[PDB]
Symmetry: C3
Subunit: 176 residues, 3 copies
């Protein structure tokens, strides 16, 4: 009856895929056709209108505002002092936001502690695909962070940044 569960799961996958294509014009991972993104967000205590894919990892204390879109394959790590994210943010596919790292733990052969620092992002921000935000970063409001960036330092409001490591390119007023 593990053969039975497997067959029932393959059937359900087929049926959910068919449903999703016909009704929502998309095909998702199996996990994402069980989990509703808005119900998941609500269960995690996020603000109304916020949505989060099944494939996201949310660690520790994470607060998120209203109407924020948390994409697939994301990491929201508030384990090292908490992570706060505002309203109307785009947290694109693959974005990873941290409040700790294990560099010293590893390099020390297992001896050093994990290093921790809180991180914060304002409202009306766009974090592009595969952006990495390290511990301790404060991102102000209305910020654009381009795809593939690595943010190592605070970003003031109304800035657009880009690069690994990210640098301020211009202001974001043209997008507003």
């Amino acid at each position: 009856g593990h053969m039975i569960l497997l067959k029932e799961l393959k059937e359900l996958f087929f049926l959910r895929t068919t449903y999703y294509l016909k009704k929502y014009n998309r095909s998702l991972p199996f996990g994402d056709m069980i989990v509703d993104r808005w119900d998941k967000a609500k269960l995690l205590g996020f603000g109304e209108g916020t949505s989060i894919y099944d494939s996201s990892i949310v660690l520790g204390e994470v607060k998120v505002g209203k109407d924020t879109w948390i994409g697939p394959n994301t990491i929201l790590d508030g384990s090292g002092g908490g992570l706060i994210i505002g309203s109307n943010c785009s947290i694109s596919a693959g974005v990873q936001i941290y409040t700790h790292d294990t560099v010293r733990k590893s390099l020390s052969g297992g001896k050093a502690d994990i290093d921790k620092a809180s991180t914060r992002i304002g409202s009306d921000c766009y974090l592009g695909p595969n952006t990495i935000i390290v511990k301790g970063v404060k991102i102000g409001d209305r910020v654009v962070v381009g795809a593939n960036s690595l943010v190592l330092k605070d970003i003031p409001s109304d800035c657009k940044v880009f690069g690994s490591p990210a640098v301020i390119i211009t202001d974001s007023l043209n997008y507003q």
Copy 2:
């Protein structure tokens, strides 16, 4: 009674048995979803061409056409929601590759007031997109193109080119690879 306890136990047993089978038959260990979902059958169900495969972990939005013998890797995004995405035959769409026809920059930056911006995207045949390549909306990639890993492609790429970088630049031709 105790229904979800029984379901959890059977899921754990199934995971152990599927992992065992995949190790023995296919010398790999995959996410649980990828040991339920068959990559070729999934491609079939999405109407992709013969020989095409796609992992469970992929997201396919809107109108996406894919040719024959194309490999769509894990953790990928094939977003055809903003006027369609077309991909040719014999392409490597590596793990982590994200291909877009829309973005939500202005929508966010305007505090939720601006529309989503959209533009169709197209990729030819015999192309390699390396791990974690990001292709933005409006981009047209010709045939026989190499995009190196970690690239961000902001503009059209002619056939027979090799590109690299964030943003990506043409560094040479791809003839060495053909």
Copy 3:
């Protein structure tokens, strides 16, 4: 019918397991990672004691991992092209992809060329930051820092810190030890 009942039970189990992880483990994980235990998975794959690996990781072919190594989510450990060896006390961050093959020629030749392969090795006490990509044939010594978003195309000696796409030696890693 029977599939609608399975769906409802899966939704219930998702809610229950999420509550469990939030309240006991202070986290919310993908559904797949709330079925598979990371240490038991690592044990099933033959990895050293103390090692863990997320459900979302793909492990291909022959792969050896030492003790107390953390293999993150959304990772690729590809030992299909002559094997991959990883030491002990390593952090293999989220998104890291480690290869021993590629399919560039196969695609660019229209499906005619063979897959190219080369073994890869990483020492002990190493850190690979988020989204690092390691290509085939690479050897990384002990006590190396690879910064986030790096692409590693060549061997890295012990006690180095590297960064970039492609990655270059920036300094030594002694300060982290």
